[PDB]
Design a protein around this ligand. Structure first.
Ligand SMILES: *[C@@H]1O[C@H](CO)[C@@H](O)[C@H](O)[C@H]1NC(C)=O
Lengths: 14, 474
């Protein structure tokens, strides 16, 4: 998936 | 000071993502070629299984890294296996060395399955382990240092994927397959060398033990029970929270099926459409469509988070996570409908007019209709992604204790891989002779429109069930 780059640090408000 | 450790992690992730997306982009075209007499459905199923394995081995990779072995050692071993697969692929692509492998309708199935399995396991473990490792290398300084590091990580992943989908896909499609498949192998070799020589400057932690062991021990021992068995009340509460979270991913499974269709069957359709030529005969790469969607995602997530969200919060009327998930699934519905409509139009048109085009080594009897009408499907997939994939994790985090990250991500990836496996299984089920939907690499004699409509229908049933459940839940 292409969104996992954003999802990797989601808790840090990536 | 720490720039010698953060930079190594960033570079390793960039190279790994570049190699993975170089492999995944042009695998359908590669298999549907001269060395392999694979059909379109078989190649699509193979790539779907590969992606499903990569995303489903992530929880097992995390458990292997945490319960035993370690974190850095797990990444090192996974990089070794992934490089082994990256050596398997070009040795197979080169005509000279392909004889030693399979000289004497799947000509070299064992080699192309072993390589895919090894690459999938390596990618799964690296993807599951690199982000906690990168967080650990900078967590000492403070929250702002981690925020900067994860901005860098976000950008590194994006540029790795984009550079892959542009350059490596173009080279593989137009120039040659040996060089375009050796480039990801060289990238993996560079990443492995960087991690091996950069190991001394890394900050490593002993294996702590993931929550999966506690999960499985509680499940085997077993509303459950509190302070009655060996397990403490906190662990039981955490397991109950995870049980409450699971149904969201269970409903998101068809979403991930249709999403992972992006570069398995949509690529096949694009190959069977009229692809423009950009040189005196270098055709446009078929992976440039998903590269364009990725560029749209990069251009829109800052746009969304900085324009739509602030004024939405200021004016109210903000939607909850479940509403955003429903909107994402509706956009997935629309994407599947658009794919079905385009495929039906193409099949109706090709009945009288067809133009022979060559993409690599194989010749495709494409239709007259232009490729660019496939853009709406990819745009809808990207919008559905930004609406649903992020909202799912936001809801899961909002319904989980703050001490249980890397287990929400593990389950998320596991259910994504389950969705990919379900999509591959559905394609195989419609590939049987009893139904005969795809029992005719030419798909002109097949019926892909019916399969796309089936995906849309199952997504619709899932969405209606999700809405009915959510009305009671909310
Ligand atoms: C497509 O290729 C086949 C095999 O070379 C050939 O018989 C047929 O004439 C070609 N059709 C067109 C429209 O070029």
């Amino acid at each position: 998936m292409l969104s996992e780059g954003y999802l990797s640090g989601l808790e840090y408000w990536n | 000071g720490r720039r010698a450790a953060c930079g190594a992690v960033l570079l390793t992730e960039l190279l790994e993502r570049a190699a993975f997306y170089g492999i995944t982009s042009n695998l359908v075209l590669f298999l549907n070629g001269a060395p392999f007499c694979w059909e379109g459905a078989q190649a699509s199923e193979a790539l779907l299984l590969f992606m499903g394995l990569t995303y489903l081995g992530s929880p097992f990779g995390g458990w292997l890294a945490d319960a035993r072995l370690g974190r850095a050692r797990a990444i090192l071993l996974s990089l070794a296996l992934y490089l082994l697969g990256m050596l398997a692929f070009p040795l197979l692509a080169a005509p000279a060395t392909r004889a030693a492998l399979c000289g004497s309708a799947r000509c070299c199935s064992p080699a192309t399955f072993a390589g895919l399995v090894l690459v999938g396991l390596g990618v799964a473990t690296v993807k599951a382990n690199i982000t906690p490792f990168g967080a650990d290398q900078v967590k000492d300084r403070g929250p702002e240092a981690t925020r900067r590091f994860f901005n860098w990580f976000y950008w590194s992943i994006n540029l790795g994927a984009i550079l892959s989908l542009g350059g490596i896909a173009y080279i593989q499609q137009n120039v040659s397959f040996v060089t375009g498949y050796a480039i990801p192998t060289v990238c993996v070799g560079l990443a492995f060398v960087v991690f091996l020589c950069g190991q001394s400057v890394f900050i490593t932690k002993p294996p702590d033990g993931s929550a999966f062991t506690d999960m499985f021990k509680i499940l085997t021992y077993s509303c459950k029970m509190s302070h009655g068995g060996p397990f403490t009340e906190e662990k039981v509460e955490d397991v109950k929270a995870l049980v409450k979270i699971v149904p969201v991913f269970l409903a998101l499974i068809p979403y991930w099926t249709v999403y992972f269709q992006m570069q398995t069957t949509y690529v096949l359709q694009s190959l069977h459409l009229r692809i423009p030529e950009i040189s005196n005969p270098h055709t446009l790469p078929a992976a440039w469509l998903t590269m364009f969607d990725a560029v749209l995602i990069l251009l829109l997530i800052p746009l969304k988070d900085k324009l739509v969200d602030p004024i939405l919060r200021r004016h109210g009327l903000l939607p909850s996570s479940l509403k955003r998930i429903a909107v994402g699934m509706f956009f997935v519905m629309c994407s599947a409908f658009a794919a079905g409509i385009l495929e039906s139009k193409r099949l109706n048109l090709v009945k009288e007019k067809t133009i022979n085009q060559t993409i690599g080594n194989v010749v495709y009897h494409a239709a007259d209709l232009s490729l660019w009408w496939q853009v709406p499907q990819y745009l809808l997939i990207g919008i559905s992604e930004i609406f649903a994939s992020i909202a799912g994790l936001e809801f899961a985090y909002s319904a989980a204790p703050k001490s249980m990250q890397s287990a929400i991500m593990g389950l998320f990836f596991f259910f994504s891989g389950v969705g990919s496996f379900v999509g591959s299984g559905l394609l195989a089920l419609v590939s049987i002779k009893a139904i005969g939907w795809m029992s005719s690499g030419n798909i002109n004699g097949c019926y892909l429109n019916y399969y796309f409509f089936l995906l849309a229908a199952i997504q619709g049933a899932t969405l209606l069930l999700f809405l009915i459940i959510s009305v009671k839940y909310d």
